[PDB]
Tab-separated table of C-alpha atoms (C1' of nucleotides) in Angstrom:
chain	number	residue	atom	x	y	z
A	1195	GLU	CA	17.846	-36.724	2.868
A	1196	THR	CA	16.346	-33.530	4.293
A	1197	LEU	CA	19.846	-32.229	5.033
A	1198	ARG	CA	20.882	-33.011	1.455
A	1199	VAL	CA	17.857	-31.100	0.154
A	1200	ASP	CA	18.500	-28.271	2.627
A	1201	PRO	CA	20.598	-25.543	0.941
A	1202	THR	CA	21.687	-23.793	4.147
A	1203	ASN	CA	25.090	-24.529	5.659
A	1204	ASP	CA	25.342	-22.209	8.684
A	1205	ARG	CA	23.187	-20.738	11.429
A	1206	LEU	CA	23.180	-17.281	9.846
A	1207	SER	CA	22.137	-18.727	6.482
A	1208	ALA	CA	19.253	-20.636	8.074
A	1209	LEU	CA	18.101	-17.535	9.952
A	1210	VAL	CA	18.288	-15.505	6.733
A	1211	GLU	CA	16.219	-18.114	4.888
A	1212	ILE	CA	13.614	-18.156	7.667
A	1213	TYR	CA	13.401	-14.357	7.602
A	1214	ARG	CA	13.027	-14.412	3.817
A	1215	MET	CA	10.142	-16.852	4.252
A	1216	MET	CA	8.408	-14.781	6.927
A	1217	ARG	CA	8.906	-11.264	5.496
A	1218	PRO	CA	9.200	-11.228	1.693
A	1219	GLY	CA	10.789	-8.154	0.148
A	1220	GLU	CA	12.391	-6.861	3.333
A	1221	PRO	CA	16.206	-7.102	3.310
A	1222	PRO	CA	17.321	-10.031	5.475
A	1223	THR	CA	19.687	-8.645	8.111
A	1224	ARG	CA	21.436	-10.474	10.933
A	1225	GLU	CA	19.730	-8.439	13.660
A	1226	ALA	CA	16.287	-8.712	12.058
A	1227	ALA	CA	16.550	-12.473	11.535
A	1228	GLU	CA	17.850	-13.015	15.072
A	1229	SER	CA	15.057	-10.927	16.598
A	1230	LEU	CA	12.370	-12.626	14.507
A	1231	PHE	CA	13.524	-16.135	15.374
A	1232	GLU	CA	13.901	-15.285	19.063
A	1233	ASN	CA	10.414	-13.760	19.215
A	1234	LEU	CA	8.742	-16.546	17.211
A	1235	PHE	CA	8.827	-19.279	19.867
A	1236	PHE	CA	11.190	-18.289	22.703
A	1237	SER	CA	9.592	-15.053	23.942
A	1238	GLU	CA	6.904	-14.984	26.621
A	1239	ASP	CA	5.171	-11.913	25.182
A	1240	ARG	CA	4.578	-13.587	21.793
A	1241	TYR	CA	4.422	-17.339	22.504
A	1242	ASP	CA	2.254	-18.795	25.275
A	1243	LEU	CA	1.865	-22.549	25.694
A	1244	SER	CA	-0.765	-22.522	28.431
B	757	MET	CA	26.807	1.855	6.648
B	758	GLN	CA	25.309	5.185	7.744
B	759	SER	CA	22.758	6.532	5.257
B	760	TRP	CA	19.840	8.963	5.025
B	761	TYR	CA	16.209	8.135	4.223
B	762	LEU	CA	12.947	10.074	4.007
B	763	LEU	CA	9.969	9.411	6.286
B	764	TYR	CA	6.384	10.589	5.880
B	765	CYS	CA	5.036	10.689	9.429
B	766	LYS	CA	1.425	10.577	10.569
B	767	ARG	CA	-0.393	13.891	10.275
B	768	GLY	CA	0.108	16.142	13.284
B	769	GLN	CA	2.535	13.737	14.986
B	770	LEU	CA	5.853	15.132	13.765
B	771	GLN	CA	7.356	15.948	17.167
B	772	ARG	CA	6.215	12.649	18.702
B	773	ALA	CA	7.928	10.667	15.947
B	774	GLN	CA	10.935	12.982	16.236
B	775	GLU	CA	11.431	12.315	19.947
B	776	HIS	CA	10.675	8.604	19.539
B	777	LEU	CA	13.367	8.348	16.861
B	778	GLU	CA	15.798	10.378	18.972
B	779	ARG	CA	15.208	7.839	21.743
B	780	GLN	CA	16.332	5.137	19.276
B	781	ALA	CA	19.605	6.933	18.384
B	782	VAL	CA	18.355	7.686	14.858
B	783	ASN	CA	19.445	11.145	13.709
B	784	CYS	CA	16.197	12.906	12.802
B	785	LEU	CA	16.309	16.136	10.795
B	786	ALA	CA	13.409	18.494	10.133
B	787	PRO	CA	14.000	22.074	8.934
B	788	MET	CA	12.493	24.691	11.253
B	789	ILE	CA	12.185	27.977	9.359
B	790	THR	CA	11.307	31.030	11.455
B	791	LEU	CA	9.271	33.585	9.510
B	792	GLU	CA	6.329	35.970	9.883
B	793	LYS	CA	2.802	34.542	9.920
B	794	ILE	CA	-0.597	36.234	9.727
B	795	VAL	CA	-2.167	35.742	13.174
B	796	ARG	CA	-4.288	37.850	15.527
B	797	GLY	CA	-1.082	39.854	15.664
B	798	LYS	CA	0.172	41.013	12.283
B	799	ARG	CA	3.068	38.891	10.970
B	800	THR	CA	4.127	37.394	14.292
B	801	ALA	CA	7.414	35.493	14.494
B	802	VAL	CA	6.466	31.823	14.066
B	803	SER	CA	8.822	28.870	13.675
B	804	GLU	CA	7.300	26.286	11.340
B	805	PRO	CA	8.619	23.091	9.739
B	806	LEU	CA	9.617	23.464	6.100
B	807	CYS	CA	6.647	21.206	5.358
B	808	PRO	CA	4.698	19.007	7.792
B	809	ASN	CA	4.653	15.210	7.688
B	810	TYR	CA	8.226	14.875	6.439
B	811	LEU	CA	11.478	14.055	8.213
B	812	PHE	CA	14.951	12.906	7.187
B	813	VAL	CA	16.328	9.940	9.127
B	814	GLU	CA	19.963	8.883	9.529
B	815	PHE	CA	20.256	5.275	10.686
B	816	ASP	CA	22.355	2.265	9.761
B	817	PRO	CA	20.079	-0.426	8.263
B	818	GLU	CA	22.283	-3.058	9.900
B	819	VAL	CA	22.129	-1.399	13.332
B	820	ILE	CA	18.386	-0.662	13.134
B	821	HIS	CA	16.156	-2.508	10.686
B	822	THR	CA	13.639	-0.720	8.486
B	823	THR	CA	10.758	-2.720	9.980
B	824	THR	CA	11.502	-1.207	13.390
B	825	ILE	CA	11.498	2.296	11.897
B	826	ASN	CA	8.202	1.650	10.111
B	827	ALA	CA	6.778	0.484	13.458
B	828	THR	CA	8.057	3.530	15.358
B	829	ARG	CA	5.247	5.499	16.968
B	830	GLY	CA	4.273	8.672	15.142
B	831	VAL	CA	5.679	7.670	11.738
B	832	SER	CA	3.453	6.542	8.875
B	833	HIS	CA	5.690	5.211	6.095
B	834	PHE	CA	8.968	5.532	4.215
B	835	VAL	CA	9.724	7.289	0.933
B	836	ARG	CA	11.159	4.807	-1.561
B	837	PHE	CA	12.557	5.312	-5.064
B	838	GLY	CA	11.339	2.062	-6.573
B	839	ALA	CA	11.065	-1.080	-4.456
B	840	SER	CA	13.962	-0.147	-2.139
B	841	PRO	CA	13.893	2.918	0.135
B	842	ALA	CA	15.685	5.969	-1.214
B	843	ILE	CA	19.163	6.931	0.002
B	844	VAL	CA	19.936	10.618	0.574
B	845	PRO	CA	23.535	11.815	0.038
B	846	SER	CA	25.351	13.305	3.007
B	847	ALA	CA	26.510	16.415	1.131
B	848	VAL	CA	23.021	17.818	0.527
B	849	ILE	CA	21.783	17.299	4.092
B	850	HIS	CA	25.040	18.744	5.429
B	851	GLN	CA	24.564	21.815	3.222
B	852	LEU	CA	20.958	22.147	4.401
B	853	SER	CA	22.099	21.992	8.027
B	854	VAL	CA	24.806	24.594	7.375
B	855	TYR	CA	22.576	27.021	5.438
B	856	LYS	CA	20.021	28.012	8.062
B	857	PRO	CA	19.043	31.480	6.701
B	858	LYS	CA	20.029	30.775	3.097
B	859	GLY	CA	23.776	26.615	-7.602
B	860	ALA	CA	22.719	24.418	-4.697
B	861	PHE	CA	22.930	27.305	-2.221
B	862	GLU	CA	20.774	29.367	-4.581
B	863	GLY	CA	18.240	26.541	-4.467
B	864	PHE	CA	18.297	26.561	-0.668
B	865	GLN	CA	17.777	30.334	-0.644
B	866	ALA	CA	14.883	30.016	-3.098
B	867	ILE	CA	13.275	27.319	-0.941
B	868	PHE	CA	13.698	29.395	2.221
B	869	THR	CA	12.341	32.636	0.750
B	870	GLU	CA	9.055	31.105	-0.436
B	871	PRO	CA	6.244	31.693	2.107
B	872	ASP	CA	3.974	28.856	0.867
B	873	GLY	CA	4.723	25.641	2.739
B	874	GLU	CA	2.986	23.424	0.189
B	875	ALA	CA	5.389	24.896	-2.369
B	876	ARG	CA	8.325	24.887	0.063
B	877	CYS	CA	8.283	21.112	0.455
B	878	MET	CA	7.856	20.566	-3.283
B	879	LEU	CA	10.860	22.794	-4.006
B	880	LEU	CA	12.925	21.020	-1.342
B	881	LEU	CA	11.928	17.632	-2.759
B	882	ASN	CA	12.884	18.827	-6.242
B	883	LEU	CA	16.291	19.897	-4.924
B	884	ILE	CA	16.929	16.603	-3.133
B	885	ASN	CA	15.758	14.621	-6.174
B	886	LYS	CA	18.153	16.604	-8.368
B	887	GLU	CA	20.987	15.952	-5.913
B	888	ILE	CA	20.170	12.229	-5.809
B	889	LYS	CA	20.108	12.046	-9.612
B	890	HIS	CA	23.460	13.843	-9.774
B	891	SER	CA	24.951	11.533	-7.135
B	892	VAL	CA	23.822	8.317	-8.837
C	1080	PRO	CA	-26.264	7.100	-11.596
C	1081	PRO	CA	-27.054	8.143	-8.016
C	1082	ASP	CA	-30.386	6.304	-7.921
C	1083	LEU	CA	-28.573	2.983	-8.386
C	1084	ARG	CA	-26.294	3.782	-5.411
C	1085	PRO	CA	-28.803	5.574	-3.188
C	1086	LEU	CA	-28.186	7.382	0.084
C	1087	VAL	CA	-30.750	5.920	2.485
C	1088	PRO	CA	-32.018	8.220	5.268
C	1089	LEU	CA	-31.655	6.637	8.702
C	1090	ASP	CA	-34.298	8.775	10.520
C	1091	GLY	CA	-31.697	9.605	13.169
C	1092	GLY	CA	-29.595	12.295	11.519
C	1093	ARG	CA	-27.136	9.889	9.867
C	1094	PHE	CA	-27.160	7.904	6.622
C	1095	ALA	CA	-26.434	4.361	5.461
C	1096	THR	CA	-23.076	2.832	4.520
C	1097	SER	CA	-23.168	3.658	0.774
C	1098	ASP	CA	-20.131	1.603	-0.192
C	1099	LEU	CA	-20.018	2.733	-3.827
C	1100	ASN	CA	-20.153	6.365	-2.728
C	1101	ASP	CA	-17.206	5.751	-0.393
C	1102	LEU	CA	-15.105	4.172	-3.148
C	1103	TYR	CA	-15.998	6.974	-5.568
C	1104	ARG	CA	-15.063	9.576	-2.948
C	1105	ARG	CA	-11.723	7.845	-2.390
C	1106	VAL	CA	-11.008	7.858	-6.127
C	1107	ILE	CA	-12.008	11.525	-6.406
C	1108	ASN	CA	-9.729	12.457	-3.497
C	1109	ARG	CA	-6.796	10.668	-5.105
C	1110	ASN	CA	-7.476	12.232	-8.509
C	1111	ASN	CA	-7.690	15.746	-7.060
C	1112	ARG	CA	-4.494	15.281	-5.051
C	1113	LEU	CA	-2.682	13.980	-8.135
C	1114	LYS	CA	-3.896	16.991	-10.125
C	1115	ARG	CA	-2.642	19.332	-7.399
C	1116	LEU	CA	0.731	17.577	-7.355
C	1117	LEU	CA	1.025	17.759	-11.144
C	1118	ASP	CA	0.162	21.448	-11.469
C	1119	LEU	CA	2.889	22.290	-8.919
C	1120	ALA	CA	5.578	20.507	-10.997
C	1121	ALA	CA	6.237	18.073	-8.166
C	1122	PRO	CA	9.315	15.835	-8.470
C	1123	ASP	CA	9.096	12.306	-9.847
C	1124	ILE	CA	9.691	10.890	-6.351
C	1125	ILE	CA	6.318	12.095	-5.002
C	1126	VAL	CA	3.956	12.095	-7.998
C	1127	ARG	CA	5.017	8.498	-8.645
D	409	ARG	CA	-32.001	6.720	-12.664
D	410	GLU	CA	-30.185	6.657	-16.015
D	411	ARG	CA	-27.756	9.564	-16.489
D	412	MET	CA	-24.147	8.658	-15.690
D	413	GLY	CA	-21.156	10.800	-14.780
D	414	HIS	CA	-17.475	10.774	-15.593
D	415	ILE	CA	-14.183	11.629	-13.901
D	416	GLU	CA	-11.240	12.786	-16.011
D	417	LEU	CA	-8.248	10.819	-14.745
D	418	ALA	CA	-5.131	12.961	-14.425
D	419	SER	CA	-2.910	9.936	-15.082
D	420	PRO	CA	-3.814	6.736	-16.953
D	421	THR	CA	-4.612	3.663	-14.874
D	422	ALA	CA	-4.914	0.046	-15.944
D	423	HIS	CA	-8.319	-1.623	-15.977
D	424	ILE	CA	-8.073	-4.331	-13.330
D	425	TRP	CA	-10.441	-6.764	-15.068
D	426	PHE	CA	-8.244	-7.100	-18.153
D	427	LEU	CA	-4.997	-6.996	-16.166
D	428	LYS	CA	-5.804	-9.584	-13.483
D	429	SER	CA	-8.394	-12.070	-14.789
D	430	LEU	CA	-6.244	-15.010	-15.843
D	431	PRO	CA	-5.026	-15.282	-18.529
D	432	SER	CA	-4.145	-11.576	-18.500
D	433	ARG	CA	-5.330	-9.890	-21.688
D	434	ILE	CA	-2.665	-7.179	-21.396
D	435	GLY	CA	0.068	-9.761	-20.879
D	436	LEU	CA	-1.211	-12.052	-23.626
D	437	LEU	CA	-1.506	-9.156	-26.080
D	438	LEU	CA	1.958	-7.792	-25.259
D	439	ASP	CA	3.552	-11.235	-24.684
D	440	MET	CA	4.958	-10.161	-21.320
D	441	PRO	CA	4.821	-12.041	-18.003
D	442	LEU	CA	2.177	-10.967	-15.517
D	443	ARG	CA	4.866	-10.198	-12.933
D	444	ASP	CA	6.587	-7.708	-15.242
D	445	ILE	CA	3.311	-6.000	-16.167
D	446	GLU	CA	2.138	-5.804	-12.554
D	447	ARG	CA	5.504	-4.421	-11.434
D	448	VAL	CA	5.723	-1.791	-14.171
D	449	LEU	CA	2.091	-0.847	-13.494
D	450	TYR	CA	2.682	-0.147	-9.790
D	451	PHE	CA	5.824	1.938	-10.367
D	452	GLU	CA	8.732	-0.310	-9.453
D	453	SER	CA	10.498	-0.947	-12.788
D	454	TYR	CA	10.959	1.067	-15.970
D	455	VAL	CA	9.955	-0.341	-19.352
D	456	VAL	CA	11.349	0.590	-22.759
D	457	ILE	CA	9.030	1.786	-25.538
D	458	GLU	CA	11.326	2.861	-28.396
D	459	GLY	CA	14.388	0.633	-28.620
D	460	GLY	CA	16.078	2.741	-31.276
D	461	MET	CA	19.607	1.938	-32.407
D	462	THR	CA	20.665	0.998	-28.868
D	463	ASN	CA	21.307	-2.595	-27.819
D	464	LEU	CA	18.136	-2.820	-25.721
D	465	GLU	CA	14.980	-3.813	-27.591
D	466	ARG	CA	11.390	-2.566	-27.416
D	467	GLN	CA	9.755	-4.578	-24.619
D	468	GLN	CA	12.448	-4.609	-21.945
D	469	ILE	CA	11.788	-4.009	-18.250
D	470	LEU	CA	14.492	-2.039	-16.445
D	471	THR	CA	15.106	-1.336	-12.780
D	472	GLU	CA	16.129	2.103	-11.526
D	473	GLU	CA	19.873	1.453	-11.728
D	474	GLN	CA	19.545	-0.145	-15.170
D	475	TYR	CA	17.555	2.832	-16.459
D	476	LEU	CA	20.082	5.290	-15.030
D	477	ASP	CA	22.968	3.343	-16.581
D	478	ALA	CA	21.218	3.326	-19.962
D	479	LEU	CA	20.537	7.065	-19.703
D	480	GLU	CA	24.193	7.636	-18.816
D	481	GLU	CA	25.623	5.578	-21.682
D	482	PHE	CA	22.990	5.540	-24.449
D	483	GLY	CA	21.199	8.644	-23.238
D	484	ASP	CA	20.255	10.132	-26.605
D	485	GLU	CA	16.876	9.010	-27.967
D	486	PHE	CA	15.839	5.785	-26.206
D	487	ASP	CA	12.520	6.009	-24.363
D	488	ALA	CA	12.032	4.153	-21.069
D	489	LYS	CA	8.801	5.132	-19.335
D	490	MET	CA	7.218	4.278	-16.004
D	491	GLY	CA	3.705	3.232	-15.036
D	492	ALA	CA	0.369	2.796	-16.763
D	493	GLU	CA	1.114	5.483	-19.349
D	494	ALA	CA	4.115	3.400	-20.410
D	495	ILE	CA	1.880	0.380	-21.014
D	496	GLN	CA	-0.642	2.519	-22.899
D	497	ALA	CA	2.107	3.891	-25.147
D	498	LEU	CA	3.443	0.365	-25.669
D	499	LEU	CA	-0.011	-0.869	-26.697
D	500	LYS	CA	-0.486	2.089	-29.041
D	501	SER	CA	2.905	1.570	-30.697
D	502	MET	CA	2.322	-2.113	-31.470
D	503	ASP	CA	0.682	-2.846	-34.821
D	504	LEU	CA	-1.842	-5.660	-35.033
D	505	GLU	CA	-1.701	-6.852	-38.651
D	506	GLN	CA	2.070	-7.250	-39.022
E	255	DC	C1'	-7.345	40.460	24.405
E	256	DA	C1'	-5.287	36.140	25.625
E	257	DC	C1'	-7.867	32.162	27.028
E	258	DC	C1'	-10.441	28.301	27.283
E	259	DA	C1'	-14.163	25.834	25.037
E	260	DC	C1'	-16.507	24.224	20.830
E	261	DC	C1'	-17.255	22.928	16.090
E	262	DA	C1'	-16.009	22.640	10.988
E	263	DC	C1'	-13.356	19.697	8.466
E	264	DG	C1'	-10.354	17.606	5.334
E	265	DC	C1'	-7.705	14.796	3.653
E	266	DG	C1'	-6.663	10.458	4.787
E	267	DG	C1'	-6.258	5.899	5.272
E	268	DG	C1'	-4.425	-0.697	7.109
E	269	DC	C1'	-3.984	-0.244	11.933
E	270	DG	C1'	-1.343	0.534	15.210
E	271	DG	C1'	3.095	-0.154	16.243
E	272	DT	C1'	8.474	0.882	18.685
E	273	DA	C1'	4.842	-6.107	14.572
E	274	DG	C1'	2.299	-8.853	12.841
E	275	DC	C1'	-2.366	-10.173	11.547
E	276	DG	C1'	-3.665	-16.352	8.910
E	277	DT	C1'	-3.766	-22.055	11.290
E	278	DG	C1'	-10.600	-28.109	10.408
E	279	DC	C1'	-12.348	-27.805	1.898
E	280	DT	C1'	-12.254	-29.300	-3.066
E	281	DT	C1'	-11.329	-28.606	-7.925
E	282	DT	C1'	-9.217	-26.118	-11.826
E	283	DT	C1'	-5.843	-23.213	-14.002
E	284	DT	C1'	-1.403	-20.891	-14.100
E	285	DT	C1'	3.327	-20.594	-13.628
E	286	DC	C1'	7.729	-21.085	-12.606
E	287	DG	C1'	11.901	-22.963	-11.245
E	288	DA	C1'	14.310	-27.475	-11.418
E	289	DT	C1'	15.473	-31.613	-14.200
E	290	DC	C1'	16.263	-33.965	-18.372
E	291	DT	C1'	17.058	-35.024	-22.666
E	292	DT	C1'	18.166	-34.387	-26.688
E	293	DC	C1'	19.416	-32.715	-30.514
E	294	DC	C1'	21.427	-29.928	-33.928
F	317	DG	C1'	28.252	-30.361	-25.716
F	318	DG	C1'	25.598	-26.657	-24.176
F	319	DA	C1'	21.050	-24.203	-25.224
F	320	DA	C1'	16.295	-25.049	-26.048
F	321	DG	C1'	12.085	-27.864	-25.957
F	322	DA	C1'	9.686	-31.182	-22.890
F	323	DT	C1'	8.342	-32.562	-18.361
F	324	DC	C1'	6.911	-32.024	-14.035
F	325	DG	C1'	5.974	-31.199	-9.484
F	326	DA	C1'	5.000	-27.992	-6.300
F	327	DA	C1'	3.402	-23.483	-5.006
F	328	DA	C1'	-0.077	-20.118	-5.713
F	329	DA	C1'	-4.339	-18.139	-6.976
F	330	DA	C1'	-9.229	-18.283	-8.210
F	331	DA	C1'	-13.933	-20.074	-7.969
F	332	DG	C1'	-17.681	-22.653	-5.733
F	333	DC	C1'	-20.295	-24.359	-2.077
F	334	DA	C1'	-29.869	-25.450	-2.522
F	335	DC	C1'	-34.337	-22.991	-1.957
F	336	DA	C1'	-37.978	-20.343	0.895
F	337	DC	C1'	-39.366	-18.107	5.268
F	338	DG	C1'	-39.531	-16.187	10.481
F	339	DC	C1'	-37.180	-13.768	14.495
F	340	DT	C1'	-33.432	-11.283	17.379
F	341	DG	C1'	-29.370	-7.752	18.052
F	342	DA	C1'	-25.693	-4.278	16.109
F	343	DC	C1'	-24.145	-0.663	13.082
F	344	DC	C1'	-23.717	2.836	9.468
F	345	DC	C1'	-15.613	7.314	9.882
F	346	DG	C1'	-11.946	10.040	12.233
F	347	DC	C1'	-9.398	12.593	14.726
F	348	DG	C1'	-6.364	15.609	15.445
F	349	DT	C1'	-5.725	20.200	13.564
F	350	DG	C1'	-7.273	24.776	12.653
F	351	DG	C1'	-10.602	28.114	12.717
F	352	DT	C1'	-14.206	30.354	15.423
F	353	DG	C1'	-16.632	32.196	19.338
F	354	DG	C1'	-18.051	33.720	24.060
F	355	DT	C1'	-15.471	35.648	28.059
F	356	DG	C1'	-13.846	37.844	32.493
G	1111	A	C1'	-39.112	3.590	3.772
G	1112	U	C1'	-32.246	0.592	3.353
G	1113	G	C1'	-28.303	-2.322	3.334
G	1114	U	C1'	-25.003	-5.486	5.753
G	1115	C	C1'	-22.997	-8.662	9.563
G	1116	A	C1'	-23.831	-12.437	13.334
G	1117	G	C1'	-26.886	-15.884	15.688
G	1118	C	C1'	-31.187	-18.990	16.318
G	1119	G	C1'	-35.093	-21.733	14.130
G	1120	U	C1'	-38.731	-23.980	10.591
G	1121	G	C1'	-39.820	-26.932	6.164
G	1122	U	C1'	-37.584	-29.881	2.866
DNA sequence: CACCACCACGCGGGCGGTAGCGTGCTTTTTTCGATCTTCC
DNA sequence: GGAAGATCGAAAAAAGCACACGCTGACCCGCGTGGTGGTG
RNA sequence: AUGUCAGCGUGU
């Protein structure tokens, strides 16, 4: 059901939607979305699960 | 693809932002007019920016995002015509680069001959705004 | 009136916070800069 | 204790109390959405004042490209202003009784 | 007379950064896109 | 038979959260530029 | 002859 509700259909589309959520107004670009998603949870300098 | 934007950098930090942007492969342009200034010596040869706290930036938005540029050290903010940042045509900046000492060329000469920087930047901004309006 | 937004001496060479005075000074700065921009016939990309 | 001062504003600015306190008095009076008013107030979209004989009507919000296209095609007498002065002119133009 | 030190100061603003910052309340009002329904 | 009125559910934004008193600390631009001034 | 922030406490 969540997949049916979900409008995205590809990895780039999902990254673009996430970037649009995080930074309203800024133009969603491939590089920007990739960097944001990588730094959100998979970067040691930003995420630290002690 | 490749475009040109305007950046208002933090006061007194023009060269720092310039070198930081050069390190990021962004083509930074800032006119450097050499004239005579009233100093302890009379009318010494001084090279000064056309107007401080202003710099043209050539960078592909796809290659480098605008958020990175806004977070570059030494820069304060962008110059945007409306919600989106303004785009500067290549012809006008190319002409400005070509005409170092000097219709459009008359405007460049008029900008260069004025000895008041606060008026120099306003005249240059008027010229670029006219060129943008003509282009669009 | 100034008496309703007073500047309190701090017996140490400095003064109090004076929030209203700060906001008024900010507004005055912006108004003066806008006047200076307008009287120089600045383009509609900067005065905006 | 009593004498007040005044600052002559170089450009008109909207009073925040009437603009923001829901329901917006400016928006209710002009029958425009709060988003459109708040975006024309902070200089991001043009707004028409005199529709004239052109297709566009009085209270239309236009982006930069739309305004430039209108000025290119029907660039004779239509008025599309920008900012708080535009809203002030729009309020002045509107008649209350009719 | 450059030469280093010292102080006005002024306009400037979100701050610092080659980005984000926020994460244990409840009620009321708006509003705005999505659905529907329905009706002329 | 498709546009407009009705619904509606969620997202957002605002407004509120007792009284009185006592005490403590901590603070109340900035900052980088330009002008000025003594100097060896 | 202030203000504010934070903390502690008293009486309800």
